[model samples]
Structure formats: C-alpha cells, structure tokens
Target: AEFPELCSYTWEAVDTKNNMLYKINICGNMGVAQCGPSSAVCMHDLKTDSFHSVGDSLLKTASRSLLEFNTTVNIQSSITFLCGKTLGTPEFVTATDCVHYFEWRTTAACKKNIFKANKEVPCYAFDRELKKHDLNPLIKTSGAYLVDDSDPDTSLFINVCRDIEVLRASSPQVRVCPTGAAACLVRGDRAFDVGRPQEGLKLVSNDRLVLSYVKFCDGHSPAVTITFVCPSERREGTIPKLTAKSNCRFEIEWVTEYACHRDYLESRSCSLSSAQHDVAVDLQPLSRVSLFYTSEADEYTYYLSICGGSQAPICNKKDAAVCQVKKADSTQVKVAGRPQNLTLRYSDGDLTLIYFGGEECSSGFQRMSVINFECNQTAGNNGRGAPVFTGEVDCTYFFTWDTKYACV
Candidate 1:
C-alpha cells in the first residue's frame, strides 16, 4: 500500500467502444465479492450487468511514481502517476490482450526530497573565437525573472555559490530553498528544486547553457531542463519560456546577456531623452568602480560598484556590485545584492541610474537603488563627486550624485 490515500477512493471510467464501465482503487480491493474478494480493478458490462475481476489487490512493484500489481485475471497491470498543476482525471492508456496500463495526474504525485540546499558555480563556455567565458554574473540575489509576469505565481531563481531565499507578493517569504540547490522554480506556494551545482549545470555551447534537475514530480530521472540563450546585447536576463516535453518533463528557455562573452567586457554607452533634455551617458570609465565607491548613510556604510564587482576584504562576491556594512567597527555585511537590470533615463538636466533585482530585505521585497546624477560643471569625472545616500522607501534606496557626466 504505497499510496494509501489513493486507495480510499475508487476511480470510474467509461469505455464507449465496449459499452463497459471500469472501477479501480490504486492499492485496495474493489468490493466486487460476487466476482472475487481480492479484485482491485473490475470491469462491468452494461448490457449483461455483470462484473469481472481484472486486477488483484496483491501489490507487485512500487516505485517513485508508478505502481504495479499481479492478478489471475490478466498478465499484469500498472498505474503511473503524474504531477498535476491542477487536479487531473484518471486515464486508461491501453488494454492489449488483458494487460492494462493506466495513467493518473495529481498534485499528490509531486513529492519532494530532503535535498533543499543551494549552491553556485562558474558556467564556462567557449565562443567561436575559442575564448572562455563565465556566466557567474547572471545570478540574481533578489527577485527571479518572472516566467510570465501574468501568471504571478511562477518564476525561476538561480544562484552559483550560496543558498538564498526569494520574496513574493501575497506569498510566503521564508527559506525558498536550503543549502545543494542551484536553481528553483517558484510556483504557487512551493519552490521546486530544478537544478544543482556543477553536475546539473552544463554549457551546451557559447550561446547556450542548460541547467537540469532531478525529478521530484512524476516523470523521468532528470525532471527539468532550463536553457539559457545568449544574444549580443548589454542587458540582464529576462523572458523565461517553459514547455512540457512529456508527462512531467519540463524545459525552460531563458534569454540572457550573461551567456555571451561580450557582455562580460563590454563598457556600455547609452542615451535617453526627456521633454526638455536630450542626454548621452557613458558608463565606460565607471568600470573602475570595480573597487567600489564608499558612501555613508545614517548607521551604515555602503560600498557601491558597477560594471563589475569589488575585491575588498569585506566583499567576497566577484559577480556582485553592491555591499554594505554597519557604520560601527562590525564587518558584518548588512546587504549584498547582485546588481541586475541596469537602466538609464534622463529628465530635466539630470541622468538617473536605477538597478533592479538586488538582495531581498526584511520587508520581503527585493532591494532597489536609484542614483540621481545632477549636472555639475565643477565635478570633473564620473566617479569624481562621491555619491550621497539620501533615504529609502520600503527596500528602495535613494542617492544623489553631483557629476558633470550628467551634463547634456
């Protein structure tokens, strides 16, 4: 009795061709005593109003998502369960010469294991030029790319080195995953372990990376495969597409810049316009901020960097762009969100830099930073005038920068 819960209820399906009705319980016998007391599956002919035993209650083999039993009425029979995003109905696959095969899809079939830990690793791939590339920058410490924002409940979170939690709207915001799990699928109220480090992660080619996870739901050994495609662009990852290859086998396609080697070294230059101003901005020189530009606020000192990460003793993430510590002597990191979604826009005579997808805070939301660079003729270079931390709302931090780089 592997699935005793399923045994409590019987399933009925009608066969139009034979004009017969089928009744069966997963692991229990059907009370068709007139025909046989041990009948687990039975078929009733409508015309004759007679019942015949098709399968016995004796268990034969029980595995992850499949169950088989033996009976004198037939050679063998099996019921394979599948993961149901929504509730599913029982299905009779085929009956050939008395051997019956059935498939049932239900949420109960999606059982998780004890491996909840998460980890990170470098994704190495060679391009057409035979140059090696690492996609560690694609890791998101805050919010994951919404597979489809419209669904509101489904998303994918990935990390390369450490365990991280995810915050969602109107949902539980606790340990989304534990410590072994490299990637997770956030659907409804549960986070499904979809990939692990090193082993589950593979670089198919310079432009493609695949992350695979073992089956927790009913399906093949490796349940999910996430494919990341690289296009020539200076941007973060977005647009996640999911497909069901079979019963519970899933493949997701994610388009990202980190998969491309160019994004790793490219210094971005962008332009933006407002009603009163046309502005051009070059972030090329600020890449030197790889060492981070120190800024102080009320009770904390924030180390901010862009284009790349810092190598300070307190900062360990080479792929992250932001780090924070208390103003006191404590070296404890108050925040360390991986910088993603770098956007630039202009308004009036000012240029703004907004970074999304940072580390989540106590508010159960991803932290965001908005820097307002005002046009200052006296300020010589981009990093010359140090930024000033203003205030924050929710988890969104604000800053003011006085630099001629914003001059139009």
Candidate 2:
C-alpha cells in the first residue's frame, strides 16, 4: 500500500480509429481504471466515450529480462509486454476488436529478478528521479566491522556488499562457506552464514536496503537481517544497533554513505515538544582561529539544556552554559552563561542554537554563538560530543556538530 504506483501503469494510446486510455495493475485490481473496480486491465474508448474491461492480469516471465502479463475478456485476449529500460514509458502497441496489445518498459521491471539467481549485493540503483546512483566505492574487500561493540572479539564480523575472508581455520561442521561468506557472524570458533546476494537481498525503498540470511547455526536457523539506511551526509558506514533475538534471530541497522543517493538533499527536520526540554550535552572542544590580521586560536565547549538542566561554570560575569577563550593565551574572550535569549533554527538537517546576550566583544557588540547540530546517524545516540567551530562572523561564532541526536 505504501507504493501502489510501482505495481501499476496508466497510459493514453491512440488507436487508428478511436483514441483510447489503458491501465494495468499487476499486484491488485486497477481501481483507477475507467472501467469499474476489480479490473486488472481496463480501457476507455474515446470515440465511443465508454469504458470496458480488457481483461484481468496474470503475470509470467518470458525470460529474465522480459515480463508478460496475460489478460482475457470473453473471446478477446491481451498480452502486455514488459522489459527493462531506463526512463521508459508505457505505450499502446496494437489492438483489434477481439484482441489488445500494450507495451511497458521500465527500470523497475528489470529489478524484479535481481535476486533470482543468488547474485551478489547490488552496487547501483535508480532513485525516484530516475537517476542512477552507484555505491561501488564503499565495498570493503579487506577488513570488516564488528557490529556488536560489547562482544568485541567474539562479535559478528560484517562486510558490506561482499564476502568476509576467513582468517582462521574452523572445523568442517563449523565451516561457513567453501569459498567465502559475504555476511557472517562469528561466535567462539564457529561462524554462521547469514546472507548472500540475489538470494537474501531486498530493496525496501529508495533509501533502504535489506539483506536476510537463513541458515542453521546450532540446530536452529538463525534468521539474520541487516537494514542499511542512507543518511543525508556522506559518512563512513557505522552500525547503530544490533540485537540477537531469542528465537535464533538477529538484526542490525547500518547507517552508511553507500545507501544515500548522489543527488539527494539533506533536508529532514526534527523537533522536540516545547513542554518537554531535554538537554544535549557535549564536552568536546570546538576550535577555530581568528581570521583577523592578528590571528588567535579560540576553543569553545557548550552544554545546552533546552528547557532546564545543570548550568556550566562561569569565566567572568554573564557566563552560564557556554565558554569561549583563546587557545593561544587561555584568556577569555567572552563567556556565554544564560540561554534566556536562545532561539532554535533549522536549516537542512542541521539545527542551530542561536544564543544571544553574553559579554561584549572588543567591537562593543554582544557576544553570541550559533551552534549548528548537523545530523549524523552513524554517531549513535550520544552524538559527536561537541560542535566544531565553523567560523566567526562579526561578533558571533558559528559551530557545527555531527551527531545522531539531531538526525530525523
């Protein structure tokens, strides 16, 4: 139901004698067809200004690249020819009083059998805009990541879009693959094969890819699934969560740059309610150098409690929750203590916390800091600790933090 358009197509075709509109749905009845519901193939006769049922669709494949849908209406029959083509459109081919013909070619049609022959993980796909995006560069041929941080050495070794090399020999009963296992989890000396290419892979959506592997690990089938999500920014692939369920099941969520489209914009926004105020704490130092004639290195640390929380120590008067000082001399430039005048602004996927009214700078303008929270799903729930100073403009300092907390 989330994607009805993927299963159906509508087109206007001109018959020599009568202009006609045709519609066909493979997954369900064509409710949008001119004929009444329960129609898989419906047509509208423009010359007669009447609607008719061409046939109900039955899908079959002519080959790996060709898909045919058969439909029959009394003595009339139709075969809709479908093939894989980029940015292709549906067209009416031919029609007789007793028979009708149509053709549709699309990239989606070609992707239907992508997992049929037990292929490797796909490295490319077309986005909603019909532009092809490639992710071959992110394939790891050497090392892999251990998704479970707690187990460490005993954890599952995960490789993206490829197989994991066996560094050690295992017993024949514990062998994962004769060649290699692209997706496998290790425990003690035993390795379990989880997923393979065309056999256990699925594209959930444009931005989501999933791989499912079912093989016996220890007298039970370990249903292992990994879902890869595309973050807006280009980031190194990171595992956000991993869980091993009781019923011999395991799941992992991977946030990776490979999952993102080349042209997709980072434009998602997230907001917490005004009634509830949760503080975003970061202790990492954001450093920047002055662009003035006499450059001075500056470092800042901030702790933000949107509604209420513990406050930061003061440098001088007017300091509250944020601090700024020269790294060169450890001299305080301006200290920001109160967020009374704090305002939140969202740009792209970054959230900027604009703090106003601190100690005055040498220019006599009130000191302010604009901390931008950039979304990074790979940073986990705790985020990247602190913001990185972007630059200083006038009396205001700008900083950006890549953190999962800011991501939607």
Candidate 3:
C-alpha cells in the first residue's frame, strides 16, 4: 500500500537541502562598502554640471560687459565658495558637505568675494580699512599691482622722520614741534594703540605741537612809529628843520608826494633817528608837487610864502636905504651926489628910453630901453650891486638913480 503522507513528506529531499544550507550559513557583516566607481563618476558629472550652470548664471547677471568669460567664471566660482556652496561632488552633496567644502575653499575665494560684496555695499556700509583696501576690479593693469618695494618696518620710521623734519622747517604759524620735542608734547601712554603703525599714523588727537619765539628791545634801541598825513602838494620853501637848537629828539618828515584823484587825503609818519644830533628830516615831495609849478605862463610868477615859524630877516631883493631917481629936462637926465652916475635919454625914432648906469659912471655902464612907462622896481639887492634889476622895467621918460648911501 502507498502512504499519501509518506509520499508528500519527501523527507530525504528536504533533509538534503537543509544539510547544504547549514554548511554554507553566513553571520552579521558590519563594515560598509564605498560607492561603486561608476556611481561616483556619475555623481561627479552631475555636480560639475550644476557648478557650471550656477557660474554661467552668475556671469550673465554680475559681469561687466568688458569682463572676459574666464574671469567671469572664476569670479562666479569664488562667489559660490564664499556663499558656502561646495566645489567637488562628494563635498557638495549635503549641507555638511558644503561646510566641509568651505573649510577648504574659503581662503582661496576671500579676496575676490570680498571685492564683489564691497561693490554692492554703500559708501558708508563698510569700515574704513575695508573701504581703503577694496580695489576696483576694472583697474586690472599690471601697473596697479606694482608695490613700493620698500620694507614697511624701515619705511615707516623714515617717513616719520621726514615728516618731523618738514614740520621743523615750516613756519611757527603751523606750530609744529621739533623732532625730539614732539614725543614730549604728544602724550604716549594715553594715546590709543590703533593696530598697525600706518593706522596709528592716521590717528589725530587734541594734542598739538607748538613753538614760540621771543622778541626783545634794549634801552638804547631806536624807536619806530608809523603815521599817516593827508595827501598834499609840496610847498615852495625848504621844509623847516625840526631841531635847529639842542633837543635830543628825532623827527621824520614825510612830504605827501602823491594826491589821489578820488579819495580824501591821507598822511603817514615814520620813525626817528637818534644817532644824529639834529633831527631835521625831509621827505621827498609827493607827485602833487609837480602840479603847483607846472603852469604855462611866459613870465610865470611864483611867490615863496613863509608860514610856520620865523620869517627870514634879510631880503635878497632890496638894500636898507631908499634911493630916488633924478630927472633933467624930460629928455636927458643925470644922477646927483654920486661919483658913479647914470644918464637917462629918450629915443624918439625908436619909441624907447635908455638908461646907462655903472660903477665909475662910465666903466661898467649898461643901457636898457622900453616903449611904455609902467616902471616898478622889485625892492631887493644882491650885496654885490646897489640895486640891479633882474627883469625889464617899462618907462616913457628917461630918469637916473643915484647909489651914494645905499646899504645891502
């Protein structure tokens, strides 16, 4: 008899399979495997494409028209790195990856990223240092990169010394202290230590460098004063001396040589000289003096009027005695009581009268004639002659004058 259960059991087949599984059984394996090389390559390609797209978009939006494609690309990559975007595929896959990527990329991107950000910021948005060091990307000439080539440590000292020297040479109006004295005047400990020497050099404070000079005058020193006088024409006579007698005082006389056409007259005075015993000083007359004597008259008459102190006692034109002329027959006349006599006669033909006068009445005789009788004698005598007239005398009749007791 065939048993259905036995037939269904197939014990031998089941036991055989079980025995094989027991022989090949495996346990827990904790270690993980790296991504497959193919997968890694695919991921890398995706990341690279993403980076390129981002860069191209940035260039399209941010680049100047003159910027080269390569420069734009580089600037975009730098900006990406600055914004914490990862560069390589493995690092850019996650936020943690981005942080890790930035750890490597930050230093490389700093300068360019900072420059880009500064361009967007307002003038007052950044600190002074940032403002000063930030450069314009457009100014990319090789000359822009050329450094001074001086050692900063040594250069600073040299510059400071040069500034000190310049300050010393400058005027006291600037009030700059000399080199060594500057430190004493500029309080050191209270001064703020602003980063580098260059930064410190820019710092200004209430403390100022000052210098002063003293002027002195001695007992025997000369005195000086300025005075103003009204503009005037120079008078005819000699300006009087101030100290004709003995008085130890100095005087400076400034004759107003110029007269303004428009303004009221002004005068100025000058200092006195103590060395000279007589302090009578005369200034050169002003230009206005020319106006007085420049009249165009044939026989121009100028009177010398004395105004200030004493009139001169002696007259140059007249002797001390009054002398009279003698007439003979209304035609011919002779001077009386004088060894040296003069004869006066009328010339009917010429309508003139002639007078002959001289020392010995004959030796030094001079003759003068005129048509009219408007005779007037200027009363003065030069000590040499009795009463010699300089200008012409007018007369119709002939008359002779005697010089017996005349005094000059």
Candidate 4:
C-alpha cells in the first residue's frame, strides 16, 4: 500500500486472477488502510471467468462502467428557453387576434327563429330602391335575403331584420278595395267579400310603417361642426347621436336590423317640439352664405348634395330626389331655402304610421307613380299623410304633393 506524498488520502488495489466473477467495492478505506477525506475511483474486479478464445467475451459481460455522472440536476436549461414564455398571469389588458362589428337583439321578445315559420318562411330585405310595396322581396338588393322553412339561413333571420314578424294582429292584411278595385287584379290575398281575383289598389295598411333615414351634411367641408341629439334606447345598434367630424359622414350612429327599421332608426325628437331639450342640431357660425356655407344659415332642414353638379337647393323634396346636375365637373353651389322637417304618427290597426310632408309634391318624386303621392289629408295643410287606401301588408309611403296645384 502507498499514500499520496502531500494529500490527506490514499488509494490501494489488488489485481485478481482470471477466475469466475467475484465482488468488488469502491472504498473510503481499503482493508483498514486510511483513505481519508478524499476520493477517486479505480476498478479492481473486471476479472474474466471461464473465457475461451472468442470475442463473445464482450457479449457475456456482466459489469458496466459509468461514462459520466453529476450531482446537479434541473429542468431549467438552454433547450427550455421558452420555459420563460407563458400564458402569463392575469393582466388588466391583452391583445386580440381579430374583431368584428354586429348588432345583437337581446331585446327581441323571443328568438326570431321561434316564429319565422310556425308555418312558411318568407323572403325579406331593405327596400331603399323599391318603387312599389308590391315588390315585397327584392332579393337581389344589397340587403336582401331569403327565409326558408326548415334549415333556414339563420343569418337572414338572426342578428338582422330583413323579414320580420309581429303578432298576427299587427301583420298587414289586404283586400280588393272598392275604391280602386281594378288595380288589385292580382289575387295575392283574397277575401270572399273583396273578390277571389282581388282588384283595386294593393294598398298598404294604414298602420304599416316605412323607414325614413335623416342624414346631416357638413359640406361646410371640414369647417362647420354639427351634432344631433335624439331619444334613443341605445339598443339594437341605433345610436341617435350624429358626429359631424366624420369625413365619410355615412357612419351609422343609428340603424335597426328590424324589418321596419324606421322605428328602429327614427328619432324620438321628430315627435318633440323644437326646444332646448328637444333634440336639436347646432351648426357652426350660423350665418355663412356659401350654400349653408362651411358654416351658416340655410333652411328648416334639407338633404343637401352636390347633385346636378350645382347647389340647386333640394329643399322640401320628400322621398329621394336629386338635382338636375350630374356632370363630372359637378361643382356644389349654395342652396337658398328653409329648414324642412318631417313628422310621423302611428294610426289604425295592423300596424301602420302616417307621415305628412313633401308639401311641394316634389315634382321629381310625385312623378314616380300616381299612387306615389299622398294627397288625401286636409287640403290646405302643408304636410302630407297617406291616403286612406287598403289591401296590402308591410307598409308603403308616398312622397305627397298637391297634384291639383301642379309643379309647373
């Protein structure tokens, strides 16, 4: 046995015979020799037993030696760099991949799918361009969609108001009217009393409602700022507030997914008096004269557009009307007129509304159809109301004027 010349520990070993395998152990002390406070490994019994002149000796090996070993272990390592990456703790803010805008109708008495086809489903859509209420479902229009009975297109019925429903009592009913019996030549909905081949005007019910979208213009061009206040339930996406700062100006502060989205988008202020609390829109510098100017005074109200390439004031024209100009060099001139206001009221059964306006018979509008004008109310009243006509559902409106007085 021998010891390290300058260290506190020593090592000793005995070479063994090539006999059958025996036992061996690493020791702090070998056979009472002092191997103190230090360590190292040296093999002693890799002895071979009953060996033949064959390389299978390596195959029948019983003992194996350690290549490497360590005392430290951990999951935190270079390969787990993302271990620092995480779902992270709850934070006050976060990022979203994408988003969307839509209208929700929780206020709906029940799911629209609930009653759409207790029987048969119908087609519906926005009729901004329909000349006749007879064109019930203008399916090709931008907002048009069909309602099937069974595996119906839910998009058409839910989250939107194209075809809608009401208690049967509120639904419009038609009959061959005696007044214009011949106009109702089609048998859409026949009543024995009216005639099997219904006739007369396919008149809309008095209670039927139509939509009227009032928009404000800021041709004041980046100058005049206008804001509107209206009685809004702040539900179903119809916001009654108008922000004048928009360059597009088409931003929808209000609109309904309702079929008769009129009530959905109408301002309660339309029925209110013009007072401080009664929704009013204030324009800038109220006196500029550049055609309601970038700021100033104009009329009671009107839909001002750079139509006809001129500023031909479109005052008092109900329904849709445009100026005589359409050329590309369409320069907008100033319009001189008064503020025109339209008022509406609901009347009769089967759900309808009455509106009186278009006092001038707006030649452009009244010329659309003979029935397009509602000339039936008080002869001299400046406003217009629907004629007492009958025989159709869904509602229709006429941009009334006194044809008797003629635009010419």
C-alpha TM-score for every candidate: 0.39, 0.33, 0.10, 0.19
lDDT of each: 0.55, 0.48, 0.17, 0.20
Per-model RMSD to reference: 21.5, 19.2, 51.2, 37.1
**lDDT ranking from best candidate downward:** 1, 2, 4, 3
lDDT of 1 by residue, 71-123 (tens): 76526667787543212335567777767778765434545311112233323
Sort the predicted structures by TM-score, highest score first: 1, 2, 4, 3
Candidate 1, residue 345: Cα displacement in angstroms equals 17
Name the Cα RMSD for model 1. 21.5
Tell how far residue 342 is off in model 2, in angstroms. Answer: 44
**Winner on lDDT (1 vs 4):** 1
Candidate 1 pairs with clashing backbones: 117-178, 117-179, 117-180, 117-181, 118-179, 118-180, 118-181, 120-160, 120-161, 121-160
Per-residue lDDT tens digits for candidate 4, residues 245-348, read 24322111222222232333223222312242222221111122223211111221222221111232433232322221223333432222112322222111
After superposition, the stretches of candidate 2 with alpha carbons farther than 4 Å from their true spots are 1-119, 131-134, 167-178, 216-218, 232-237, 264-408
Query: What number of backbone clashes does candidate 1 have, counting pairs of residues 3 or more apart or in separate chains?
Result: 10
Which of 2 and 4 is ahead in TM-score?
2
Model 1 ranges off by over 4 Å? 1-118, 140-145, 149-180, 183-191, 198-201, 233-237, 243-246, 262-264, 267-294, 300-386, 389-408
| lDDT comparison, 3 vs 4, better candidate | 4
Residues 1-408 of candidate 2 have per-residue lDDT tens digits of 211234533323334345565555544355764555555566766568788866554432344333344444443334433322122334456876666776644333433442111223444454444333444434443345567646654456555544553443233322443235655666666666665433323557877877665543466666667777776554433554685544557788877654555334221122333222222323222221121112123454343422233343334344443556555555544554244655554322335566656665443345566667776767633443344566765456666667665654
